[PDB]
Amino acid sequence: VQKGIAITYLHVTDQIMKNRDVIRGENFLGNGEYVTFAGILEANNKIYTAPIPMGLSVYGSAFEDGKWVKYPELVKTEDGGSNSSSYEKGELQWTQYPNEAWVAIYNDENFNNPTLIRTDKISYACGRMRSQYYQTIWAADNGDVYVFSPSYAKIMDADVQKTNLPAGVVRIKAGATDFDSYYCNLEELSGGKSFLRCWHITGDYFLLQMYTGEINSRGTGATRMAVFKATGNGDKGELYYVDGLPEPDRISSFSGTPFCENGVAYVGVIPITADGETNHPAIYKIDPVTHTATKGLTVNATGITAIGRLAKDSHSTYVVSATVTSANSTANYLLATSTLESGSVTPGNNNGFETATGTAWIFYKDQYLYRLQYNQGNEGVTTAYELNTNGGIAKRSNEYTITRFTTYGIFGENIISSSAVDATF
């Protein structure tokens, strides 16, 4: 038994799902540890990915008489642990090289002969929340790739496994195969705070979801937003907290993926409502130049899962995927609107397109909306939606059965989903 990387393609135009032969993840970075891919970033007709080390497995720890084991006291001796993060006997759980970051560059969606580049300025580049990995490598409008790192390995129980690198940013220039001299220490601009998630807005502007307290595994305290300009202070980066949002104590959660359009961002905000008030979840437009937020469309639901556009043959409409949870049961509703800046929308009074909840939601341009879901759950299939000829939301005919994924993205005409699995070679 060995660890490998599983990659699945959904071809958008022809409605076909394909599985790639499992890639060997054992000793992917040259130190015996298996990795998980975070982010599938299309840029410069190439694929950029962050291989995040997962420590040694059972096979890795016993390879050639413990060749790869640097800290023998960290190897599990007993089989136990919570089912979410249960471990087997004889494997080393987390990475033992937390003071570096790796980037893999591929030339196409066939994932052959990676170009691996290493940096020692930042820890591994991915957001982490329990079992969820968040992409933190993004691309500016000129092709440059920015690699952000929140230094989550700072909350490791073992001191050897803690990182000493503050949360930061490095850059790969367009058409280059190595890191340049650019670095930014984000914990010096944010008053010693880290971030949970980051997205691109426009140009070299990025939106960061900042912790109000200490970085943790449950995401407690990530109730503020900031705008980071990479080339702000004479190519040194500048960070400004967003104004106009509700106070951090009055925020329950943000939407997973904002919608970027016309040089601004659209973010779903869920507030905590004071006894006597009527604050409902809404869509906030964030302007990065003035780093300000403005309340827009009101959503009358318990959650927001996707914001985007869908168009078909002279029809076009904004789509908001709202979530309603009640009776310990949860449903999702696609709601069509003509603006994200005024008005209100609700699934009440029998409105909206009803579906089951999906693991991920991803818009393919303004052509399709894909609901990604693996074998398990209420409806363990991957579905897709579009606009019919007369302006209504309809479901695509074909459906798919996919394996569990931890990252996803779009390259060319393919939606790519990747995870780390057990495999035999």
Partner: protein
Amino acid sequence: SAVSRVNKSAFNAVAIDAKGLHNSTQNLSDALAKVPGLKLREAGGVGSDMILSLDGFSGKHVKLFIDGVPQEGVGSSFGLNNIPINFADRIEVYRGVVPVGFGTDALGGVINIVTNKNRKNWFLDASYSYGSFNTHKSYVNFGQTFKNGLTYEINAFQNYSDNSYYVDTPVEEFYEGGGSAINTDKVEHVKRFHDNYHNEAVVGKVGLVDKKWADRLMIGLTYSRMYKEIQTGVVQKVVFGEKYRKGNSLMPSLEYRKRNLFVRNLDVAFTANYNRNFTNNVDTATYRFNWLGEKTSLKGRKGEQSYQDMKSDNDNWNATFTANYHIGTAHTFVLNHVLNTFHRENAIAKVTRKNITGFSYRLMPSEHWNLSVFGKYYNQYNAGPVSASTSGTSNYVRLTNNVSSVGYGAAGTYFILSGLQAKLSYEKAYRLPTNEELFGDEDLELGKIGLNPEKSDNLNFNLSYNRQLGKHGLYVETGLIYRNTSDYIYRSIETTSNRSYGSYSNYGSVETKGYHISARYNYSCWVSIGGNFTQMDVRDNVEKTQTGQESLTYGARMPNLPYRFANSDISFFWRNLWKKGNTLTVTYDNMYVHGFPLYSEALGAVETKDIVPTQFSHNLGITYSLKNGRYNVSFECKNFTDEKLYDNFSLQKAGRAFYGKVRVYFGG
């Protein structure tokens, strides 16, 4: 007699005599399906996942007993859906209000299976049945008692089926280019190929009866085993070809029972049981299957859903004490206590220990009316490991929890006329929190929050009329139910607020109002007609959301829950047909279920909503008996109009099916 005493009690109880069903191919759940307000929902096939609902309460809110022994700690190899009806002498269902003598926390109600404890000096019973989809079911029960007081009894049974019935579903096509896809516009009629199931069970009891120091002292041992093949997932479109599950259970028990222990009219019963269960879930295939039985390689991936070779072994044990006393017929006293200990762990063990005490008193000054008052005390202790670290996975400590509550109730009945009876009952019931809900997060600070037990107010009213008019016999009953439930323990919504919350919380309230009608007409001994109708509304009763906003589903019907259903039957009897003592029975049956939506009825465009359709199915059976039940042959046809049936949203059940049974009984 016993069925009559249960039916005429002041409680809202229904007693069914199972001895009239021993010639059929039914299980315990099939017999229970005829109780008013009781609904069965099966995934489809023999040994499939079964959910029993009573007045809208399902799962943990309805408690099962066999001769007063709790069954919540028994594995799936010995369960309601896989025990033949021949196992039971009768079945009692208590709805809402539960009399003292069971000692359990149940918001919904209690089902009690009573076996035959008045056997002859020697007896033998054997039956075999063959069916449509390669179904084989056999049952044996034999025993004897001797003149020195020694007695023994042996039960054994097995159920086997392939469940190879046809369903309609879109199939995943594997393309020549290497891809695959499931086109929803194309629906195929395909047979089931990986649905085989079979379970076996043996029960053995030996002891002494009719002694000066014990009316009954018995030692028993039960062994059960089960093998299952997983055919689909939650929806039918997901299909599997290699995943399977295995299990087995071992159950020793001791029983003691005596009357007039130290003073006259003082009866005592003590009971002890131990249950050890083993489970094994295997999912290790390297291929992807479609509904046609074809295979495609997963290209190095193991596990068609998720790689798994999991084995688990759990244990638990319970003890029960009951004392009865009475001063004449006007004053009756019952005292009960139940202890139940569970060890989830397959240095800190996840331990749950539950203690329930009950006391009841009945006053019956005349034959016109009687009244009962009772009180119960609930106490649960939970213990688990919790961590206090940055990631909470290094340092562990013990965290304990104690929950106590007091329940109470009353039940009265009045006989307005000779055959007219009116019942009124009330109880305040609880459901105590579990170890997984309390210590699921395994965090020290989140553990101290704790959870309150779920609570319910249950009110019952009944009016029944029974009369015999020459050869005509008539029985009519109507009933009203009110349930008010609060402090439901629900999953918490995922948030990133500055405040940390546990994975569960006391949030949820449901208001249920309902009525039922039951009728039974008999003429002489050759025609019997009967039916039940149930109509209830179950409303979400929470005004605000978890974040403080007005709830969209407040006041709406609770989704994924049937709320109107009916059943009816007619039986014809020809006694002394070909010789004296030989009888012929022809029985017709039908079931009606009203359609319901999968999600909340008030949300989403109606044409885009997942709905379970309205269903109406029919059953037929014929039996012939020789020498007063000594030899019996039976033929049954189920779903003889071949309707598409779905207890769950998209899980189709079997169509027209044919079964044949042969049975013999000897005794003396």
